[PDB]
Amino acid sequence: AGAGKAGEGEIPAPLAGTVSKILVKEGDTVKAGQTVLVLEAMKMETEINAPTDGKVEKVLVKERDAVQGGQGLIKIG
C-alpha cells in the first residue's frame, strides 16, 4: 500500500527526482546536515542532507536511478 516511503532508518526523499551522484557509501559515516546524495528534478540539482548523525549501512539508491519523494533513499545507523 505504498510506492515508496521512508522514516525508520531510511531517509525520505524531498521530491520524486533522479539520482545524479552518491556522496555516501556503505562504510562511511555521515552527519545531520551533511550532503549524502545529489538529486536531479525539474532540471535543477538538489542536494540531499542526512536527517540525523549516523553511518550508511546500506544504499538502496544508485546512480542514474529514479527515486520518489518520501521514498527511502539511504539507511542510516
C-alpha atoms as a printed R data frame, in Angstrom:
   type eleno elety resid chain resno      x      y       z
1  ATOM     1    CA   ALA     A     1  0.000  0.000   0.000
2  ATOM     2    CA   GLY     A     2  2.955  2.267  -0.756
3  ATOM     3    CA   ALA     A     3  5.011  3.062  -3.850
4  ATOM     4    CA   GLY     A     4  7.995  4.163  -1.772
5  ATOM     5    CA   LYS     A     5  8.497  5.906   1.565
6  ATOM     6    CA   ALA     A     6 10.968  6.288   4.426
7  ATOM     7    CA   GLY     A     7 11.079  7.106   8.135
8  ATOM     8    CA   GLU     A     8 12.670  4.286  10.126
9  ATOM     9    CA   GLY     A     9 16.325  4.031   9.120
10 ATOM    10    CA   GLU     A    10 15.683  5.035   5.516
11 ATOM    11    CA   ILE     A    11 15.846  8.768   4.836
12 ATOM    12    CA   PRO     A    12 12.787 10.137   2.935
13 ATOM    13    CA   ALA     A    13 13.417 11.931  -0.355
14 ATOM    14    CA   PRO     A    14 12.382 15.622  -0.681
15 ATOM    15    CA   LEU     A    15 10.819 15.027  -4.094
16 ATOM    16    CA   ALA     A    16 10.484 12.454  -6.868
17 ATOM    17    CA   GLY     A    17 13.563 13.175  -8.975
18 ATOM    18    CA   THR     A    18 16.573 11.249 -10.260
19 ATOM    19    CA   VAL     A    19 19.826 10.197  -8.599
20 ATOM    20    CA   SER     A    20 22.784 12.092 -10.045
21 ATOM    21    CA   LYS     A    21 25.699 11.108  -7.814
22 ATOM    22    CA   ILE     A    22 26.257  9.349  -4.492
23 ATOM    23    CA   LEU     A    23 28.291 11.090  -1.794
24 ATOM    24    CA   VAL     A    24 27.972  8.489   0.959
25 ATOM    25    CA   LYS     A    25 28.637  4.761   0.697
26 ATOM    26    CA   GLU     A    26 28.269  1.702   2.923
27 ATOM    27    CA   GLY     A    27 31.180  2.192   5.315
28 ATOM    28    CA   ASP     A    28 31.416  5.977   5.587
29 ATOM    29    CA   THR     A    29 29.794  7.961   8.392
30 ATOM    30    CA   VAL     A    30 27.530 10.969   7.884
31 ATOM    31    CA   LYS     A    31 26.331 13.897   9.984
32 ATOM    32    CA   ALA     A    32 22.923 15.525  10.418
33 ATOM    33    CA   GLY     A    33 23.119 18.200   7.726
34 ATOM    34    CA   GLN     A    34 25.980 16.904   5.587
35 ATOM    35    CA   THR     A    35 25.071 16.065   1.994
36 ATOM    36    CA   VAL     A    36 24.581 12.353   1.340
37 ATOM    37    CA   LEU     A    37 23.432 12.323  -2.288
38 ATOM    38    CA   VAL     A    38 22.614 14.694  -5.143
39 ATOM    39    CA   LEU     A    39 19.234 14.624  -6.882
40 ATOM    40    CA   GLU     A    40 18.050 15.920 -10.250
41 ATOM    41    CA   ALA     A    41 14.492 17.109 -10.852
42 ATOM    42    CA   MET     A    42 12.921 19.840 -12.981
43 ATOM    43    CA   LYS     A    43 16.361 20.476 -14.476
44 ATOM    44    CA   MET     A    44 17.538 21.547 -11.024
45 ATOM    45    CA   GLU     A    45 20.210 19.835  -8.934
46 ATOM    46    CA   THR     A    46 19.021 19.242  -5.375
47 ATOM    47    CA   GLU     A    47 21.350 18.271  -2.535
48 ATOM    48    CA   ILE     A    48 20.204 15.683  -0.002
49 ATOM    49    CA   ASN     A    49 21.254 16.214   3.610
50 ATOM    50    CA   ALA     A    50 21.078 13.479   6.241
51 ATOM    51    CA   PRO     A    51 18.268 13.906   8.834
52 ATOM    52    CA   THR     A    52 20.443 12.840  11.763
53 ATOM    53    CA   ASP     A    53 24.003 11.768  12.540
54 ATOM    54    CA   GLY     A    54 24.848  8.154  11.735
55 ATOM    55    CA   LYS     A    55 26.523  5.855   9.216
56 ATOM    56    CA   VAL     A    56 25.470  4.460   5.842
57 ATOM    57    CA   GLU     A    57 24.703  0.775   6.368
58 ATOM    58    CA   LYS     A    58 23.020  0.196   3.006
59 ATOM    59    CA   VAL     A    59 22.387  2.401  -0.023
60 ATOM    60    CA   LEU     A    60 19.191  1.499  -1.866
61 ATOM    61    CA   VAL     A    61 19.530  4.408  -4.286
62 ATOM    62    CA   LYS     A    62 22.010  4.117  -7.150
63 ATOM    63    CA   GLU     A    63 23.453  6.470  -9.762
64 ATOM    64    CA   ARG     A    64 21.268  7.088 -12.812
65 ATOM    65    CA   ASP     A    65 18.319  5.769 -10.810
66 ATOM    66    CA   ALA     A    66 14.841  7.237 -10.382
67 ATOM    67    CA   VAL     A    67 13.529  7.981  -6.895
68 ATOM    68    CA   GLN     A    68 10.301  9.224  -5.323
69 ATOM    69    CA   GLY     A    69  9.547 11.991  -2.826
70 ATOM    70    CA   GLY     A    70  9.425 10.343   0.595
71 ATOM    71    CA   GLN     A    71 10.864  7.054  -0.674
72 ATOM    72    CA   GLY     A    72 13.744  5.668   1.381
73 ATOM    73    CA   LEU     A    73 16.962  6.988  -0.142
74 ATOM    74    CA   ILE     A    74 19.610  5.657   2.235
75 ATOM    75    CA   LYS     A    75 19.640  3.756   5.524
76 ATOM    76    CA   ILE     A    76 21.371  5.414   8.470
77 ATOM    77    CA   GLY     A    77 22.708  3.652  11.558
